[PDB]
Amino acid sequence: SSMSYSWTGALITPCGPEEEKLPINPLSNSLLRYHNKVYCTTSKSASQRAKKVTFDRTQVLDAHYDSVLKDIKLAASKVSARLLTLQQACQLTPPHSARSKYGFGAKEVRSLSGRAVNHIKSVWKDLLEDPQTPIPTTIMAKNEVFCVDPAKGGKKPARLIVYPDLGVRVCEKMALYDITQKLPQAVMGASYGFQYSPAQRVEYLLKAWAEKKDPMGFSYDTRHFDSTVTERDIRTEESIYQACSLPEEARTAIHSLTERLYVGGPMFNSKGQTCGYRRCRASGVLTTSMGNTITCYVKALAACKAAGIVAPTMLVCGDDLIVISESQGTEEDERNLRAFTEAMTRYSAPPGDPPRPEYDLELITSCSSNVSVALGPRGRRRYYLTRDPTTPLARAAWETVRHSPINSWLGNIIQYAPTIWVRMVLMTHFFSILMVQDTLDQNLGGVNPLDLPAIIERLHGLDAFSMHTYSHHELTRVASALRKLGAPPLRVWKSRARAVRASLISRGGKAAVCGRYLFNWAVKTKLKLTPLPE
RNA sequence: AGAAAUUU
RNA sequence: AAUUU
Ligand SMILES: Nc1ccn([C@@H]2O[C@H](COP(=O)(O)OP(=O)(O)O)[C@@H](O)[C@H]2O)c(=O)n1
Numbered sequence: 001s002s003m004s005y006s007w008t009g010a011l012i013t014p015c016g017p018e019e020e021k022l023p024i025n026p027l028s029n030s031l032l033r034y035h036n037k038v039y040c041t042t043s044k045s046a047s048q049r050a051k052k053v054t055f056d057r058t059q060v061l062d063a064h065y066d067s068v069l070k071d072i073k074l075a076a077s078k079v080s081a082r083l084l085t086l087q088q089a090c091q092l093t094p095p096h097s098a099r100s101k102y103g104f105g106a107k108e109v110r111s112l113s114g115r116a117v118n119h120i121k122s123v124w125k126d127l128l129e130d131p132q133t134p135i136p137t138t139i140m141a142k143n144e145v146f147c148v149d150p151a152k153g154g155k156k157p158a159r160l161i162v163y164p165d166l167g168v169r170v171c172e173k174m175a176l177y178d179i180t181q182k183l184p185q186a187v188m189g190a191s192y193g194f195q196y197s198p199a200q201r202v203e204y205l206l207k208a209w210a211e212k213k214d215p216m217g218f219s220y221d222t223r224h225f226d227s228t229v230t231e232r233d234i235r236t237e238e239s240i241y242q243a244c245s246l247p248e249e250a251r252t253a254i255h256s257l258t259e260r261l262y263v264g265g266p267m268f269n270s271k272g273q274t275c276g277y278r279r280c281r282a283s284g285v286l287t288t289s290m291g292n293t294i295t296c297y298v299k300a301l302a303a304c305k306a307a308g309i310v311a312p313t314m315l316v317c318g319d320d321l322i323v324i325s326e327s328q329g330t331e332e333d334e335r336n337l338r339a340f341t342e343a344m345t346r347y348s349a350p351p352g353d354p355p356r357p358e359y360d361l362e363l364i365t366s367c368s369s370n371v372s373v374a375l376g377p378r379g380r381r382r383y384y385l386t387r388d389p390t391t392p393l394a395r396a397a398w399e400t401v402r403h404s405p406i407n408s409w410l411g412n413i414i415q416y417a418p419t420i421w422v423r424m425v426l427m428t429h430f431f432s433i434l435m436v437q438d439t440l441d442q443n444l445g446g447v448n449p450l451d452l453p454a455i456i457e458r459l460h461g462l463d464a465f466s467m468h469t470y471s472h473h474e475l476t477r478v479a480s481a482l483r484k485l486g487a488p489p490l491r492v493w494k495s496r497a498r499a500v501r502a503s504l505i506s507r508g509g510k511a512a513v514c515g516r517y518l519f520n521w522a523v524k525t526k527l528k529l530t531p532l533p534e
Numbered sequence: 535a536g537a538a539a540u541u542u
Numbered sequence: 543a544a545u546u547u
């Protein structure tokens with residue numbers, strides 16, 4: 001029936017200028033050599049993304065769907081939820097949120113400027129009065145950085161972002177924010193993945209795995225998920241929101257937002273022209289993340305039920321899920337995953353890469369990450385979270401006039417501190433750079449480099465400083481990513497580490513603690529590391 | 535230059 | 543600020 005998009009043919013314009021690297025990258029030309037491989041998805045590529053997401057959806061549901069949907073509404077009934085004062089909603093607006101077409105931006109919104117508040121009052125009135133005139137949206141290409149992959153296309157075309165004006169964004173929050181805080185958790189219980197920390201994720205997966213007599217695992221992801229969301233899906237999303245205790249005033253706002261915005265509408269490029277019309281998810285609305293997650297969850301649990309998946313333990317984050325089940329033998333397991341996929345396709349969530357049964361936790365990737373294992377100080381197995389380092393390294397080398405990648409190095413150092421690639425490569429590079437600059441005592445994205453050992457202890461355990469004997473998978477993949485980006489191989493990073501280390505120790509203070517803890521892997525004379533007050 | 539979550 | 547979807 002429904003096409004996901006129609007296009008006028010008007011271009012998808014830039015929302016400002018898109019910078020390119022320079023002939024010298026002084027911060028990353030000692031990190032890696034192959035800068036030609038590091039690119040940023042551009043709005044020029046958006047046309048290509050559009051061709052790939054424009055297609056015809058033919059959803060076909062069934063008792064398993066209907067049944068899972070029922071039970072989900074019985075959960076929604078436990079939720080009571082409130083409107084949010086116009087002012088509270090204003091102040092959940094992020095600092096840089098794109099300005100309104102109507103002469104005010106996020107400074108005003110956030111500080112409750114009167115011009116902004118009246119406009120928002122009027123917009124909210126109009127949602128209550130008019131429950132049908134479609135609401136215009138702006139469409140734009142997301143600028144992300146990646147490493148080229150000649151196997152998988154060369155250069156990814158840019159993601160499409162579609163969003164209403166700022167006034168509308170605030171009103172969304174008024175109507176729905178509280179729901180976004182109660183509904184998913186209530187509907188999905190422990191399957192709601194965003195509720196967990198990475199440590200909890202890892203523990204959860206191991207618990208699910210240990211619980212089975214004979215575990216089987218797999219993951220799933222929908223191709224161009226936002227395109228695959230049907231008008232009917234979005235209304236079923238509404239109907240699930242409504243199944244809560246709500247003020248009547250919310251119900252009207254919800255229903256109006258659904259009908260005028262969420263279910264579809266016209267699209268304008270940044271230069272103002274009509275660009276096309278939309279009959280699927282607009283990734284840009286408040287309900288993007290909750291919608292996606294709940295909707296993926298319905299289809300997936302129905303699909304599980306269709307396929308025969310036994311004793312499923314699920315974990316869902318948007319369109320990404322992991323199911324750990326009781327295996328029924330591999331011959332049956334393959335058959336059931338094929339069925340799972342057929343069912344998901346019928347429901348309109350067709351697979352990017354068709355899934356496969358797995359019987360080892362390391363081989364299950366989801367949200368671009370997987371669990372892995374190394375040995376700890378005493379020799380116990382220590383399970384942790386990791387990923388292909390290709391992208392983070394690529395982003396580590398993204399230097400332009402406007403952008404510095406140092407903050408990425410730090411963010412990755414913290415999130416993935418226990419990984420061999422963070423420990424040997426990123427840390428080494430990061431510290432090495434700040435020492436030469438003489439900016440160790442500086443603050444980056446409100447974090448003090450010299451705090452890192454503490455920060456890493458609070459978040460990952462003291463084990464993150466002594467881990468050893470990384471897996472074959474992990475070693476292979478790291479080696480292979482460095483070669484792919486023209487980086488030194490790990491042995492060189494060993495050298496650079498020793499040098500940085502001694503150079504850090506000789507400075508004393510917290511710097512020396514950094515040198516001693518973050519780099520104890522780099523020495524044969526390995527010191528006994530004690531917990532840290534801070 | 536969209537939203538949310540986690541981390542800080 | 544970082545990452546993810
Ligand atoms: N930057 C992003 C990335 C994903 N998403 C949402 O999450 C969905 C699934 O993410 P994905 O990483 O599998 O990308 P798709 O190719 O499935 O669109 C997208 O279609 C978007 O609706 C988003 O809203 N903003």
Ligand SMILES: [Cl-]
Nearest residue numbers: 376378379380
């Ligand atoms: Cl141990």
Ligand SMILES: [Mn+2]
Nearest residue numbers: 221222225319
């Ligand atoms: Mn997807």
Ligand SMILES: [Mn+2]
Nearest residue numbers: 238242254255
């Ligand atoms: Mn309604």
Ligand SMILES: [Mn+2]
Nearest residue numbers: 221222319320
């Ligand atoms: Mn995904």
